[PDB]
Design a binder for this molecule. Structure first.
Ligand SMILES: NC(=O)C1=CN([C@@H]2O[C@H](COP(=O)(O)OP(=O)(O)OC[C@H]3O[C@@H](n4cnc5c(N)ncnc54)[C@H](OP(=O)(O)O)[C@@H]3O)[C@@H](O)[C@H]2O)C=CC1
Ligand SMILES: NC(=O)C1=CN([C@@H]2O[C@H](COP(=O)(O)OP(=O)(O)OC[C@H]3O[C@@H](n4cnc5c(N)ncnc54)[C@H](OP(=O)(O)O)[C@@H]3O)[C@@H](O)[C@H]2O)C=CC1
Lengths: 298, 299
């Protein structure tokens, strides 16, 4: 089983590197910075358990997906279309593309562009690029995938490599739950450059999160999404279990990078407007992140 | 007539400075930073028409309001109560207290604490403290005041000093119009540190402003306020007449000072909540300015 990782960043390197450690044939399609370090001394895979250098192929040409039976597509939502179109010509016709991304539109976007079988996955992991060719795993690293033609074979192969997997007939719901969590925290954290535990103690913040969340639940209902039963409590409890954590969006803005805000609060805005559902709290958070992003850019 | 300016900052020094320049006995209750500058070289009153050093009395003791017939109360809303109680025992009983402030609760707050006649005023000016003891008037400088027992005599005295004044039976609506304008621009400008003309080009910003304003207009209606007829259009046009202007709230956050946000979007939140009217856009803007302020103070 040949595996290609399109967009070998924090997520791609962990899952890709774990499969390489298990003995599969894996090639990471990464940026020159990382390709140069992977070809020099291999992929440094630093886990909460072990720390190793892993011999994997790496390339910056999206055609290196050639011959892969399974492509883990791990770019950010903002790059879904460009990355998919870059790899489309070389992609095997029988290849299974897994979307290891956050957001609710990636699988649909991929299927609109590609004839190959696509399956959405929900990624539960904490990872970062510690430097060139270096991935650092802070915690978790499991997956929930839609049903694929590979069946239980796909989950058996991941478990055998050190990444547990569960097939679900409601990946839509899991992806939306994660989206609403991100709508509640990411923009607030990014705009103020404060961690979740500091954030929730500001005056009015619990009531802002209520407003944001009720807007999202209204959109999820209109969209026929079945969310977990205690989703609101689970969201509120994140400030307690990750008190010193700042959001990915916060880290993007601190570093002058473009965030995924168009696929977080922006999605709720676009969707709410299309459905006649007021989304004012979500709209202020989206507009504010984009204004800050645009100042940094110009 | 004897006049005291309580909270001689940008507004207090301009209006007080014109009166002192016109021959009135004016005393400025300012912070020490300024008091030492005035006691040294006098108040510098720079307009786009002239530049002058004006001999005025200044002090930091709020008891200096003693024996004033007219008190111009020009502190930020955050300080109305503390400043009002500071000057309360010293204040002449027949003194007229004019609130030259922004917000819609100052005159009521003052009347709750003081027995003296209080009149709300709407301040139309652009003024800054260019440095210690130095007031820079950028434009306008007229007042619209509620009716007073002093009647037309009050407006005739101000006009004589180069300060145009009108009396209105709807200062309420004028104060609310200014509030809604500030609810639309101040927090956005402060959170992002961008001027009005840059802000309004952002993706989704016109729609945020619509949302903020509609919440404000809903609260204003439930409160029985009569606003000017084209208030929405006048607010949107500010982005084109002051394209390079950042808000007073932006300048406060840039300098690590506490803003008046509890009396801008915070008033709308508190009132909307009390009236059962959703105020989500305003609530986000208020919470965020407060979070940023709190970080700059402790952490
Ligand atoms: N990081 C985490 O712990 C979590 C992440 N997620 C989600 O998983 C997804 C990926 O996240 P993450 O790994 O952190 O993001 P990263 O940016 O770290 O990884 C993606 C990488 O793909 C690269 N890339 C984009 N286009 C191309 C291209 N055409 N050719 C080659 N490389 C390309 C990017 O380059 P460049 O650097 O220039 O953009 C980047 O290095 C996101 O949707 C994210 O929200 C979900 C759960 C956990
Ligand atoms: N500036 C402008 O162009 C205009 C302002 N306004 C409104 O008018 C009001 C006044 O604003 P502005 O003049 O700009 O604000 P300023 O901060 O410049 O002026 C207030 C001054 O009073 C001082 N003060 C506060 N408490 C006391 C006290 N206990 N004893 C002595 N001094 C005290 C303040 O000290 P400290 O510096 O420590 O806070 C400050 O120096 C506001 O409500 C504002 O929104 C309306 C239209 C235009």
């Amino acid at each position: 089983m040949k595996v290609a990782i399109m967009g070998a960043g924090a997520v791609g390197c962990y899952y890709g590197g774990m499969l390489a450690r298990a003995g599969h044939e894996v090639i990471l399609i990464a940026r020159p910075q990382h390709v140069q370090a992977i070809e020099a001394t291999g992929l440094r895979l630093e886990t909460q358990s072990f720390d190793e250098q892993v011999k994997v192929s790496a390339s910056s040409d999206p055609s290196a997906v050639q011959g892969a039976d399974l492509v883990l597509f791990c770019v950010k939502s903002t790059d879904t279309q460009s990355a998919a179109l870059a790899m489309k010509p070389a992609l095997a016709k029988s290849a299974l593309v897994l979307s290891l991304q956050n957001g609710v539109e990636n699988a649909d976007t991929l299927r609109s562009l590609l004839e190959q079988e696509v399956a959405a996955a929900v990624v539960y992991v904490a990872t970062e690029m510690a430097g060139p060719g270096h991935v650092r795993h802070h915690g978790r690293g499991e997956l929930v995938i839609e049903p694929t033609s590979h069946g239980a074979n796909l989950a058996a192969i991941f478990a055998a490599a050190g990444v547990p997997v569960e097939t679900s007939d409601n990946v839509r719901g899991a992806l939306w739950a994660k989206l609403i969590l991100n709508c509640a925290y990411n923009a607030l954290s990014a705009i103020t450059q404060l961690p979740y535990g500091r954030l929730v103690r500001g005056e009015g913040v619990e009531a802002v999160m209520r407003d944001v969340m009720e807007e999202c639940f209204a959109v999820a209902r209109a969209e026929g999404v079945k969310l977990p039963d205690d989703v609101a409590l689970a969201i509120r409890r994140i400030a307690e279990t990750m008190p010193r954590q700042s959001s990915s969006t916060a880290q993007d803005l601190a570093r002058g990078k473009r965030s995924e805000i168009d696929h977080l609060n922006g999605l709720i805005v676009r969707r709410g407007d299309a459905l006649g559902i007021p989304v004012p709290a979500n709209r202020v958070l989206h507009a504010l992140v984009r204004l800050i992003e645009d100042k940094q850019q110009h």
